[PDB]
């Protein structure tokens, strides 16, 4: 029951008319061929063998000779008995035992002639494999085609017939005249393909007579897919063959033969998730003495720093510099270090996200209308956030995440992706109104156009760099560690270009001097929970619970959707998850930090996935032509600590971060908003609405359902999204999480009556397939339908 | 020997337990299947049938019933004789003769209900094509599978068994118990696949016994491709299956068994070419009473007007407005009408090209350093151009274009594409030089940035519109009628945007009032050949012959390559073309027209291709899943006349063409320069220089030759091109056609010394395949490896 490595040699004349047995083909899992003109290995492909060759092979084995359990060690030894019983049993007479043996004892030459190629090829083969050599050639001095099949009792390594030092178990030799109308190369290919299949060598092991070999051939024949003699003209061999083979194999085989579990005990989830990860604590600070962690932490720093200033500049601009970029950087370091040192899932990198920014900008306007302080409302919301977190954990309410399906996960992403574009365009339109474009700090000549030029330049540089990265010019291993390295290059290029111009004016960032708040005139370091400049109304210390529920829903969804995808069965995450502990450590820490005037934090979905797949290592011992598979993921909690410490220390360069114009940030904002739309199964279903049915794709949600019903589903999704967007534009904009949570009952009740269970299974398919920066045009953005 | 259309019915129970023989599959050339859940036709695919079904079919054909040469015209009668010979031939014993007859005379239900679907289907089916039906079913009261095969003596329609009104010749029916472990649907598919092959029905027509049918099956089996029972990954089939199929077919087939010619008569080319096109003169003006021509005229007018102003603007700008856009517009119409009235190939759209502009630019600087006059030099060059034209045709030599291969046909295009980009970037640098970007005609504030914005916007709009046009959102018939329709929209958008902003200054086109020269202060309407202001030197009377030779080489190459490519064999261009009446007409007209201070004209190869493939109509009677083929090309000489007349009359819109900013023209210039690089074989070979060999494509010039050899070929091309670029930048810039005519012998001599005859058949591949706006990302720019 071993693995078989097959090699097909041939007897072809050299440049100096030397017989010189030469290697022709090599089978491990799929066939590889050698071209005569370029003498290099080709790409692997499925071995498509003819039928007359199979018929000829079955016919000629009737008169062949078999040597089962042969006790020799060397090729000269085995050849003597082979030719002896060859002559004994009819084929080739006694007047030929001088030249047939001459052909067997010859020199074998390979094209790639402790080395490099040999070591690589041996690595490709499984560790414990047996080898087989098939020798076919045309000989002029024979009469009829003769065959000999042998099986050595003990696996013995030969001298030079093979390509790598692997012992042989079978040897198949075929010699015959060229007068007979037979293709010997095709017969050799057919017998190699037969020997390279499981059910044939598994019977050759147990074979003891020609009858067993004939039965094995017959049983192999009645499992194949015969193609007609019709010329193929393109993609015809993609609809039938694969699905037909899979269906036939399934039919032949069929007829042939929980962390999210309620326990009824208060605070049981915390105990269950702390009794697993913490025992393996010393294994988290010692399994990171490898170069891959050092390589990763360099590029994770940029990926964690770029959103820190992009989301901080807008927050500082909108809130009149009440919460600027300094607080966002300082808040990430304090919570990140605590989460890395004390958390259960250290692969999560926490940071400010999109929906939190939208909620903050919606809440800021609500306080301004009612003439209330903004910092104290946040701290009073923060206190109620801890109570809900403790209540939810004690009752083990984290199992509700199973009820959030793909129907809700994409409307949210589409909304958050439209918000960014609207914000960017509105900001541009406003800049074009502050400074009119008339002739010869308002009323400046070249501020209206310079901002547009910078925004377009940074957006297009980032877009084209992203397009270039996902191409054939980058190897898979270098494409996986590099976590979207286009933004740090576009920002640097635009800053360098803007630095050269020293005559015009443009708005810059608001980084302060030293360790101090961005606006050391309106607030201090601690926020008084009773009132800073005027008493806080007593009636909103109990009425602030309502926004607390909405922000808790947002944080809970954003944190629990990410953790499910990170910890799957396809990814080799072995130690343990943190479903219950992570929520507590993320909601309590943010509620505490809300006192010192710092924003809340979330799971940082895309950054989390990039960090998750930047530490993985892929298997190297895989057969060529097969899809790559994951081997193991390095689990440690020292790279997150280093990233958090570097982000925190990145505040000491405030003399450099002050030179960044406030237009490159909006260009990056628009770029992220545009690129977040990839991977959601709503955008392409909307694209399909503008195509003829003949051009529709071959995805799983078009073949199994009718077109009109799919269009109806898309129309319902559009109606829900439009209703929610219309609600958001009003003065009750502080309610959209409630509408987002009022769409799960709409799917469990209303949407179940219209559609059949089959269409719900086909369309609402929350299954997902992991990506590892393979193929073309697929990156970490395609993994999750959740926005950035 | 006719075509056969077969359909596979299958007895499947209805909703209310009704037998209702139902249609399951339909073969014309490739199989089409009906989906069970959505009951709609799927995409065509190759019929990949199993092997056990074939074996069972061969086994059960041994004791079947063959009603050869039946003489009935109704289904009840043929069913009566079928059941009669079944009960006679020991298939149904004694008690089942009416229940079986009950199943045969039932109602057939097709999944498609003077109509629409069958009118559409009748076109795809060949004209004199016979039809046949195969009926299979899993019934209980048989106790043993029974078969009947018939051949009606005369083709007779059989009411509603078929979905289209086409007579039937055969009908194959199979009934058997479900307790037999036979997949009846698979057997029906297999028998349909055999019946759809030429060598099987061509032997069933003249068969006389079941032995002939068995022999036909056996001969069909020994032509197929057997696939092993191994899972496919999607790409493993493309490498093997098609090539193996082709080689096996070639082996089986083997086992089974000038307009360019000098005569010796002076002016013989004109005599030979007049007697072919002029007899078919009245048909030219009568084969144009079709609705295609209106859309052709309008879209070709839009596609031919844009190059007139784009090339006219730069020529007017950088020649001190000696010749501008008005002269270019008047020159195109004056010669276009003459060529469309007296020409031999009226599909050529003559107009100003790139290389002519480059040569004019180089020549203008040469006359500004020797203190000569630019206009009179041109007219003295023009006189020598006619003499060379008359000498080159009387001594017939319009055959050296066969010696201009693809080696020297791509350096030219890449050179032009680099020249365009360099020109645009130099213009941008200069326009920034005149207007500095400091704070608060020269020195204007907003001219430096507005020009950049206008240049970038139009280029990006055109690029993205071209990318969108070649997607799957557009059908194959609307994509051919419209040419490059992104420029006429980008120009309009960027003119409308600039029109609103009226607070600043920017350079605009210089269009004069009425029919007058663009500079009515330094030149008139007729150029004096002896001198306008100062006497012209006499030593330039004969020293002007060399530039005449150079421009003659340029014009000859540009016209002859286009003439060769258009008049191919794949394109069904009837009547005849002319290689001798075109060159003489074009060169003589240009030489005479240079007297009045107007530029020369060329073939305008991309416009010629767009004109050629906009009048073509593709056949509709083609089997689904096959490559489209050309029915005919409408040949007429009234659309070119209309286009030329419209272009000429477009001069009265001088009050609107004066509002176009000059930066949009440079944006379009850069767009054309960038987009002209598609299709040249040198560019992808340059791309391959920076890619690992494992990711190399499967094109014909990588498999058959080694990597280092193609790298050396590309290095030699780069060396020659760099030498030509270096010599083009000196004070002798008007000598690069000499460099090209020198590098032509270089290919032959050196590359046959070095690279051997085998590789100089795939590296220097002049084959080229026609494009008809099919596939994805392929347009008229890929057809022609020449500049715009
Ligand atoms: C790209 C976006 C921003 C454009 C605006 C939204 C559309 C995609 C909306 C516009 C009107 C909608 C349509 C209105 C009516 C219908 C009926 C729906 O089917 C039925 O109502 C009954 C048919 C059945 O049940 O099978 C088919 C979808 C469709 C075309 C809807 C699909 C979604 C549409 C096209
Ligand atoms: C726009 C850029 C890409 C221009 C420059 C392209 C590459 C930098 C060029 C520079 C010089 C070139 C090289 C010049 C000489 C050779 C010989 C070629 O070798 C042979 O094939 C000789 C041996 C043989 O007989 O096969 C090896 C490629 C190489 C290094 C060439 C590969 C391409 C190179 C490195």
Curated annotation (Swiss-Prot), chains A, B:
Catalysed transformations (reactions):
hydrogencarbonate(in) + chloride(out) = hydrogencarbonate(out) + chloride(in)
Keyword annotations from UniProtKB, A to Z: Anion exchange, Antiport, Cell membrane, Glycoprotein, Ion transport, Lipoprotein, Membrane, Methylation, Osteopetrosis, Palmitate, Phosphoprotein, Transmembrane, Transmembrane helix, Transport
This protein is called what? Anion exchange protein 2
The function of this protein is: Sodium-independent anion exchanger which mediates the electroneutral exchange of chloride for bicarbonate ions across the cell membrane. Plays an important role in osteoclast differentiation and function. Regulates bone resorption and calpain-dependent actin cytoskeleton organization in osteoclasts via anion exchange-dependent control of pH. Essential for intracellular pH regulation in CD8(+) T-cells upon CD3 stimulation, modulating CD8(+) T-cell responses.
Instruction: Tell me which domain of life the UniProt entry assigns to the organism this sequence originates from.
Output: Eukaryota
The UniProt similarity line reads: Belongs to the anion exchanger (TC 2.A.31) family.
Transmembrane regions: 293-316, 322-359, 369-401, 411-432, 448-465, 481-501, 535-557, 583-606, 638-683, 710-746
Provide GO CC annotations from the record.
apical plasma membrane; basolateral plasma membrane; focal adhesion; membrane; plasma membrane
Q: What disease is associated with this protein?
A: Osteopetrosis, autosomal recessive 9: A form of osteopetrosis, a rare genetic disease characterized by abnormally dense bone, due to defective resorption of immature bone. Osteopetrosis occurs in two forms: a severe autosomal recessive form occurring in utero, infancy, or childhood, and a benign autosomal dominant form occurring in adolescence or adulthood. Recessive osteopetrosis commonly manifests in early infancy with macrocephaly, feeding difficulties, evolving blindness and deafness, bone marrow failure, severe anemia, and hepatosplenomegaly.
Q: Name one GO biological process term.
A: digestive tract development
Q: Where is the lipid attached (S-palmitoyl cysteine)?
A: 720
Q: What is the effect of changing residue 168 to A?
A: In OPTB9; uncertain significance; reduced chloride:bicarbonate antiporter activity; affects function in osteoclast differentiation; fails to rescue impaired osteoclastogenesis when expressed in a Slc4a2-knockdown cells
Segments on the Cytoplasmic face = 466-480
**Region annotation (Membrane (anion exchange)) ranges:** 293-788
Which GO molecular function entries does the Swiss-Prot or TrEMBL record give?
Answer: chloride:bicarbonate antiporter activity; enzyme binding; monoatomic anion transmembrane transporter activity; solute:inorganic anion antiporter activity
Q: Which residues form the signal peptide?
A: none
